[PDB]
């Protein structure tokens, strides 16, 4: 069941028309297009092709999402019961506290300074990430007058006619006028994302199943064609549905999903106790509503708010960083993902390289030969006679499909744009600045029927009618690879006379690509069949889906080799990733010979390592004698590939230190990324064809080629690198690693702080010794050294070690793991509250009551009425006298807190380095000490704050005595981490690393 | 890579599953030891940092004097029946409704009894009337055990009597007994003429510390009580020479200055506060503390 | 002034503002370093 009916409602068209009626209908001229006179007409007459801006949400209301998010909404409950508590106090008593009045005013004004702090910073990714939303402007490939000229999809106008190949996305909805063999991507329109054909053919009523429209917002597979707009903007069938036609949309990124399970835990935890306090300050003869206080202080006291609006700040962070990289990221959560990179599936042209060939040499006549390959200023070096070259010229003019776009033939041929396959740019510019007019050659030999080139097939082909005298009358053409195309022939072509196929030529073939392919050159191979007239008369009916000719024993003409030089940044670029620790695989459809040569220039392949062809070839013997281990790098041709069970695929993922597919399928691009997937790694796949579309998906993570990528494989990927520029990944990886090293940290910090919090009361029961600490002092050690310095972790600056330490194992190195509850809880955390314990003790001793003296006077201490309390110096105290020296303990206890969580923020400002490496450049880490200390200086020494928090002031020497403590903090991290910078592997690190 | 790591576990039987190799969910004994261990060694050490920073700590303060005493400042004053909520409620006529106040206050009176101050090294005799305050020396150990200043049942007026077992109190108008709260170091000052009292100044300005009951606060207040002050010297007040208070490691068996009210009122079937105070300039009161250097105490003889 | 015993709390609490005025003023300092 779906709701295909309610969107079939509002649908009318013209997928009826004959080609005649179209055409009489729109105006354009099914074959020149329109005028760009009267486009530029209509353009001004309808407005430009986009849909109309669809507001999701309002400034305001989403300021109050984050002024309740997750755990500022429970912080308000808090705050709700303390005032609450507050009104039930004027009315069991005359004239009451102050306390719980005033902690319901900090409580609530902090909610409300974080919410609305994470807002203004959220509200800035926001602002930053949709500066991105308008920087690709997706361009459009129109026929107008005759010629054929890409813009910007937002001028294409209702009538124009559109030229859709291979993942290029549908600009408008169109009626398809022509098609060869295309495919078109109706998933977001239908679900299943099988491709469907489109052909001119009218073969359903209903506008959505017939095979000759169109629709905008899908994308062409692959395939080819040519249609005409008959619906711009909001007026597309996909404009018409009122949803989402871009913006929300799915997925939950790990790390977002390591958050929420944390969160999920810590929440527990954080209630259990709270209310199994509570119960036990009610058995403990806690006031009714003091226990409710005291359980809901508790449940804050464990429940780190901090982590969102941090989470908030270093994704905010990393938007601003990777906006300066040009770096589109789609979802800023999946940076995190990106660090966590074990192996980088590459492709090789337009990603590695930098896709723009230019023609070096040609094999033909059993000779190499050179063409001029920069500042020509000539043609080639031969003859331009040969019959043998003018025969190759030919097709390599013919089978290319590649044109000038409009407005060019007044200037240089070097200087005028083109469109279509780089290759076939490349082959174009090349015959056109030598031989002759390439235009004028394809009108010569109209061509009959053709099947347009694909990653799969990896081939091109046509036929031509032929207008020579010696011409059979039909000329079939085709290119591809080398290797694919020499197999389908049977005659080479020799100084103008065709002659068998031996095997010397074979094999002089062969040293050819060696040698062409081992420069690093392309190489396309060429040949043609001069189709016989008997079997091929006049009006003969070729056809191109069940083959109606001979696709064998062609006649081999040469080949050409183009020079395709690899991307500036790339070879440091995948050097630092793999000093990052990942693994970098070169996946490519092109030969392994050409494949092997850009792998070593840019260094996916080290001149060191051998290749078991390598050892063969040098020890004499067989290559398929070698020992297949004896190998460290390999070259896995496709046409093998084919033939691998996933053990064996696995094998020489899991043996091989440097892998390079050559010649692969697009499936077989995504096998590989599947068994590297299957392995336990984390792949990141790096395209820009069309071809690459289904590794790009299957990834963890998709990167795109901005400018070179198709729209299809931009529209996979989870990042787009707006410049080309390869070196972002590692930026961006870098940044991924940062993310989740100050989130750790964050956390880290943030638990210590529970013991501490916790252990008094425990200890207030299990040795009825006077409170070290209560609920009022509680809160202050939390919203005081738990927030501003927890959150200053996100501004930390990058250690040193993490393009130089191995990628993070997502089954052990989890955001939270049992090492970080080991430091936080069973070493760091019992630390700091020994300081606050010992200062306690101090305090009391030096005002009479020694320690030993202090087990079992909770009970009588507590108690309002018994005013003869004797000290160890037998002394009397009052109540509220012993209760000034209890309660001014507390006030220690918390100032001695914050002592010790300066240390700890220090020593979790670091994971490896020392913190004279790391250095203070963290000035909102020094802006957190200062204010948190101001504030217990503040909180202590302030008139009336113990007549309202129950704070009194502080003698000097009470302040010293938690130092001690954080000394001790500082140094035992500081030996901890300095074991481990120099025993990798050691118990230290195997254990004590969170 | 050839690396053997991750988790790739199919079963959550290793929760306690064990026949590969490593149990409880843990590693092996090797390590389920060596961390065990770790820990041991750390916990114990960093128990050893407390124990040590305390010891410290200690041999920074006297055995002699508290290093504060600035929040003892003013002392209290305190009664000795046992305040349920300051409030001492019985019925007259029944023993029972009073046998728990008689109990605490008989308790208290023990360690002042004459078969209790026996000996003449502990126990010095200071006069039969109040006196300066005996300054026994410097609060060191160089004297030992310094003099007690005695304290006879007889002076506390009415309120000691001589029964078998238990002390024959007062059932009809009870017996209040207040006194004053020990800081070690302390010299009591009676007041002049300057800062007078709520009630004219009862003899004996250069050595008694003056005690007065009277009603609830001084405002308009339902006055009902007949007051009686039971002294040494016969005096409202406190004898100067007991002070000051030499602490429990110089002064183990130090007898405080004692001194009694015997309410015998005028109202029966009713609940009356009455609030005593001590006056004086070594003596403070605080309206939060409802017992520094004064009294709430709040009876009701309903039969 | 000075009599019997007892603590200046006066002092204590006055150096213990002048040091809350120097943490937080300083404190912004280092966040707005021009
Ligand atoms: C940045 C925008 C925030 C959205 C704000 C929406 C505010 C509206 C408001 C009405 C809420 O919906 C709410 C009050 O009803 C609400 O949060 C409830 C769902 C919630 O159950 C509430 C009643 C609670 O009691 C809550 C305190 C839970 O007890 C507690 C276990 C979860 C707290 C928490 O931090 O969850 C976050 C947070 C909600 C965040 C919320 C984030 O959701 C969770 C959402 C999803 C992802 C995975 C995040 C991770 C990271 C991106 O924040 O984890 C997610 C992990
Ligand atoms: C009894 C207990 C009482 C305790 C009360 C404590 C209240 C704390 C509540 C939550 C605080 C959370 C804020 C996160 C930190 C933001 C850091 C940042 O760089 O801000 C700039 C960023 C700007 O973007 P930016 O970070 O990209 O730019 C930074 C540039 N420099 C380096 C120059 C600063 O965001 C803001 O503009 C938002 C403003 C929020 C500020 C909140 C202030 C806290 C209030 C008082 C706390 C105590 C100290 C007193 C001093 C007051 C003056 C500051
Ligand atoms: C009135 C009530 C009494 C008040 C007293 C208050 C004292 C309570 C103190 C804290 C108790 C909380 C327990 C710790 C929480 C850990 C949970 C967690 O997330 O671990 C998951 C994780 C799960 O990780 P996992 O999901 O990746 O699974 C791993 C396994 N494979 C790979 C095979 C899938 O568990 C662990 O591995 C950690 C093991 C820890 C060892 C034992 C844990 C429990 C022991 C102590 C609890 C005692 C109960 C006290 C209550 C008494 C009440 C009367
Ligand atoms: C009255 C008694 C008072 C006692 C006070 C005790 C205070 C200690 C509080 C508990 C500490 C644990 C906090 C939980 C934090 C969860 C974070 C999270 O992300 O989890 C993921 C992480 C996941 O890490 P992980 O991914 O590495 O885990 C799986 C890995 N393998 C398979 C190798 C195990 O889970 C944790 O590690 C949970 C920590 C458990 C540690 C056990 C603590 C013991 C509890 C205290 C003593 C028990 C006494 C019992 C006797 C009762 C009698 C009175
Ligand atoms: C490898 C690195 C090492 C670093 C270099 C080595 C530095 C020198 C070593 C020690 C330094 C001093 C500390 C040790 C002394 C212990 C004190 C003690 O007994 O405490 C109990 C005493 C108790 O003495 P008491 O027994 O007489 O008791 C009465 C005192 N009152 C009434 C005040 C309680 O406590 C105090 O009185 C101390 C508090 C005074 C106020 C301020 C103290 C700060 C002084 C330290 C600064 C260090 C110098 C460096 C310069 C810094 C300038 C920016
Ligand atoms: C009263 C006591 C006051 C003590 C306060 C002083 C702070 C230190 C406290 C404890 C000592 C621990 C410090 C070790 C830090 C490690 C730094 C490091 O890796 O160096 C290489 C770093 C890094 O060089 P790198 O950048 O070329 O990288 C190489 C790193 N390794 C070698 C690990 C492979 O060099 C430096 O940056 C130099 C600065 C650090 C020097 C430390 C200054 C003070 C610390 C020592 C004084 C205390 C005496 C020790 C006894 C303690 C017992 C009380
Ligand atoms: C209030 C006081 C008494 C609570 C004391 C809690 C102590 C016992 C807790 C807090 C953190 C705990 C440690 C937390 C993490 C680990 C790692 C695990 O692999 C071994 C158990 C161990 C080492 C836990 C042992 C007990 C532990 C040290
Ligand atoms: C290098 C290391 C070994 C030196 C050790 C010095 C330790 C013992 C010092 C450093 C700071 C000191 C504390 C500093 C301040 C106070 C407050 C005082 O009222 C009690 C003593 C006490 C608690 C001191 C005890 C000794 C102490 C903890
Ligand atoms: C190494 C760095 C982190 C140590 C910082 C130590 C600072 C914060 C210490 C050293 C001297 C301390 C001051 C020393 C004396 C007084 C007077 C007292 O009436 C109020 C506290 C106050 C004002 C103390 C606050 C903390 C203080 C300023
Ligand atoms: N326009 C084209 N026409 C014919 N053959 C081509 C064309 N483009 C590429 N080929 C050949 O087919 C191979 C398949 O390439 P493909 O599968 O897309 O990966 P890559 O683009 O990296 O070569 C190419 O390496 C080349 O030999
Ligand atoms: C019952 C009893 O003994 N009451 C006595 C009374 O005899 C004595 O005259 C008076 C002196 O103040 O004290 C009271
Ligand atoms: F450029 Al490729 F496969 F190497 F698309
Ligand atoms: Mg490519
Ligand atoms: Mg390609
Ligand atoms: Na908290
Ligand atoms: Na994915
Ligand atoms: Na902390
Ligand atoms: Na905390």
């Given amino acids: 069941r779906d709701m295909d009916e309610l969107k079939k409602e509002v649908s009318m068209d013209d997928h009826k028309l004959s080609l005649d009626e179209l055409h009489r209908k729109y105006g354009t001229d099914l074959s020149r297009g329109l005028t760009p006179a009267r486009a530029a007409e209509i353009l001004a007459r309808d407005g430009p092709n986009a849909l109309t801006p669809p507001p999701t949400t309002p400034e305001w209301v989403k300021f109050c999402r984050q002024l309740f998010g997750g755990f500022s909404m429970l912080l308000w409950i808090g705050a709700i019961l303390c005032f609450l508590a507050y009104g039930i106090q004027a009315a069991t008593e005359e004239e009451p506290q102050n306390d719980n009045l005033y902690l319901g005013v900090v409580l609530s004004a902090v909610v409300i300074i974080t919410g609305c702090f994470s807002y203004y910073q959220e509200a800035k990714s926001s602002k930053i990430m949709e500066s991105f939303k308008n920087m690709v402007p997706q361009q459009a490939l129109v026929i107008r007058n005759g010629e054929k000229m890409s813009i910007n999809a937002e001028e294409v106008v209702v009538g124009d006619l559109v030229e859709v190949k291979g993942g290029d996305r549908i600009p408008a909805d169109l009626r398809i006028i022509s098609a060869n063999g295309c495919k078109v991507d109706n998933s977001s329109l239908t679900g299943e994302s099988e491709p469907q054909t489109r052909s001119p053919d009218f073969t359903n009523e209903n506008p959505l199943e017939t095979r000759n429209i169109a629709f905008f917002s899908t994308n062409c597979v692959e395939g080819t064609a040519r249609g005409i707009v008959v619906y711009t903007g909001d007026r597309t069938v996909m404009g018409r549905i009122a949803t989402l036609a871009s913006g929300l949309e799915g997925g939950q990124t790990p790390i977002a999903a390591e958050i929420e399970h944390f969160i999920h835990i810590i929440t527990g935890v954080a209630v259990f106790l709270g209310v199994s306090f509570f119960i036990l300050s009610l058995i403990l003869e806690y006031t009714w509503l003091e226990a409710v206080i005291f359980l809901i202080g508790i449940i804050v006291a464990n429940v780190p708010e901090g982590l969102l609006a941090t989470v908030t700040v270093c994704l905010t962070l990393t938007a601003k960083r990777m906006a300066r990289k040009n770096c589109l990221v789609k979802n800023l959560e999946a940076v995190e993902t990106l660090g966590s990179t074990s192996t980088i599936c590459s492709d090789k042209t337009g990603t590695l390289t930098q896709n723009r060939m230019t023609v070096a040499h040609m094999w033909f006549d059993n000779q190499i030969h050179e063409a001029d390959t920069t500042e020509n200023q000539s043609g080639v070096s031969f003859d331009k006679t040969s019959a043998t070259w003018l025969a190759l010229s030919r097709i390599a003019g013919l089978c290319n499909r590649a044109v000038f776009q409009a407005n060019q033939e007044n200037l240089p041929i070097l200087k005028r744009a083109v469109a279509g396959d780089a290759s076939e740019s490349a082959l174009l510019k090349c015959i056109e600045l030598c031989c002759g007019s390439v235009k004028e050659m394809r009108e010569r030999y109209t061509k009959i029927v053709e099947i347009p080139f694909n990653s799969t097939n990896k081939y091109q082909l046509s036929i031509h009618k032929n207008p020579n005298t010696a011409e059979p009358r039909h000329l079939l053409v085709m290119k591809g690879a080398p290797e694919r195309i020499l197999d389908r022939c049977s005659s080479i072509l020799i100084h103008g006379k065709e002659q068998p196929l031996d095997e010397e030529l074979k094999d002089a073939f062969q040293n050819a690509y060696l040698e062409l392919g081992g420069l690093g050159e392309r190489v396309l191979g060429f040949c043609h069949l001069f189709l016989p007239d008997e079997q091929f008369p006049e009006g003969f009916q070729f056809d191109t889906d069940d083959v109606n000719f001979p696709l064998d024993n062609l006649c081999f003409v040469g080949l050409i080799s183009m020079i395709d030089p690899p991307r500036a940044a790339v070879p440091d670029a995948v050097g630092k990733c793999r000093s990052a620790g990942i693994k970098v695989i070169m996946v490519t459809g092109d030969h392994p010979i050409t494949a092997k040569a850009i792998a070593k220039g840019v260094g996916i392949i080290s001149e060191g390592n051998e290749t078991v062809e390598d050892i063969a070839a040098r020890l004499n013997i067989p290559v398929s004698q070698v020992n297949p281990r004896d190998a460290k790098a390999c070259v896995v041709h496709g046409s093998d590939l084919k033939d691998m069970t996933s053990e064996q695929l696995d094998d020489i993922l899991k043996y091989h230190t440097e892998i390079v597919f050559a010649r692969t399928s697009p499936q077989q691009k995504l096998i590989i990324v599947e068994g590297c997937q299957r392995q336990g790694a984390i792949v990141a796949v790096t395209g820009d064809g069309v071809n690459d579309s289904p590794a790009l998906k299957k990834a963890d993570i998709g990167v795109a080629m901005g400018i070179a990528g198709s729209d299809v494989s931009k529209q996979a990927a989870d990042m787009i690198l707006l410049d080309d520029n390869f070196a972002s990944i590692v930026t961006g990886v870098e940044e991924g690693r940062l993310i989740f090293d100050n989130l750790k940290k964050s956390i880290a910090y943030t638990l210590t702080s529970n013991i501490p919090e916790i252990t008094p009361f425990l200890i207030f029961i299990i040795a009825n010794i006077p409170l070290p600490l209560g609920t009022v002092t509680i809160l202050c050690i939390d919203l005081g050294t738990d927030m501003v310095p927890a959150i200053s972790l996100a501004y930390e600056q990058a250690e040193s070690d993490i393009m130089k330490r191995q990628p993070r194992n997502p089954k052990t190195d989890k955001l939270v793991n049992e090492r970080l509850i080991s430091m936080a809880y069973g070493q760091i955390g019992m630390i700091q509250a020994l300081g606050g314990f010992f200062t306690y003790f101090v305090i009391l001793a030096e005002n009479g009551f020694l320690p030993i003296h202090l087990l079992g006077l909770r009970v009588n201490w507590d108690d309002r009425w018994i005013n003869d309390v004797e000290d160890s110096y037998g002394q009397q105290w009052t109540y509220e006298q012993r209760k000034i020296v209890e309660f001014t303990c507390h006030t220690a206890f918390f100032v001695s807190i914050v002592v010790v969580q300066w240390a700890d923020l220090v020593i979790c400002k670091t994971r490896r380095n020392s913190v004279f490496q790391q250095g203070m450049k963290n000035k909102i880490l020094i802006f957190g000490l200062f204010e948190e200390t101001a504030l217990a200086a503040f909180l202590s020494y302030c008139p009336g704050m113990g007549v309202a928090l129950r704070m009194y002031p502080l003698k000097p020497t009470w302040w010293f005595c938690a130092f001690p403590y954080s000394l001790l903090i500082f140094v035992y991290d500081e030996v901890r981490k300095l074991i481990i910078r120099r025993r990798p592997g050691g118990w230290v690190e195997k254990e004590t690393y969170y | ?303 | 002034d000075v009599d019997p015993f007892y603590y200046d709390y006066e002092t204590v609490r006055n150096g213990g503002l002048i040091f809350a005025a120097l943490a937080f003023i300083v404190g912004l300092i280092i966040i707005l370093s021009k």
């Avoid at chain 2, 009862?202 to 510390?209: A, D, E, G, T």
């Fill in chain 2, 1 to 303: 890579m050839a690396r053997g790591k991750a988790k790739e576990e199919g079963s959550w039987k290793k929760f306690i599953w064990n026949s590969e190799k490593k149990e409880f969910l843990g590693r092996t004994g090797g390590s389920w030891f060596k961390i065990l261990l770790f820990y041991v060694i750390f916990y114990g050490c960093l128990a050893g940092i407390f124990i040590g920073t305390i010891q410290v700590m200690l041999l920074t303060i006297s055995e002699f004097k508290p290093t504060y005493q600035d929040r003892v400042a003013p002392p209290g004053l305190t009664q000795i029946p046992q305040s349920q909520k300051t409030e001492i409620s019985f019925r007259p006529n029944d023993p029972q409704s009073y046998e728990s106040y008689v109990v605490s206050i008989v308790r208290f009176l023990e360690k002042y009894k004459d078969l209790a101050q026996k000996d003449d090294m502990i126990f010095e005799d200071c006069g039969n009337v109040p006196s300066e305050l005996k300054e026994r020396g410097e609060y060191n150990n160089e004297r030992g055990e310094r003099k007690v200043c005695r304290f006879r049942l007889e002076w506390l007026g009415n309120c000691s009597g001589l029964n078998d077992e238990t002390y024959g109190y007062k059932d009809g108008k009870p017996c209040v007994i207040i006194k004053l709260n020990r800081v070690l170091g302390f010299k009591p000052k009676p007041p002049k003429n300057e800062s007078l009292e709520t009630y004219p100044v009862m003899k004996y300005n250069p050595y008694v510390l003056p005690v007065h009951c009277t009603g609830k606060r001084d405002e308009d207040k339902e006055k009902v009580g007949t007051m009686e002050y039971f002294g040494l010297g016969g005096y409202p007040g406190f004898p100067l020479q007991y002070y000051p208070y030499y602490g429990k490691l110089l002064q183990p068996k130090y007898l405080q200055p004692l001194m009694a009210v015997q309410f015998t009122n005028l109202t029966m079937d009713t609940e009356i506060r009455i609030e005593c105070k001590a006056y004086g300039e070594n003596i403070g009161y605080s309206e939060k503390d409802r017992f520094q250097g004064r009294f709430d105490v709040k009876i009701e003889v309903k039969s």
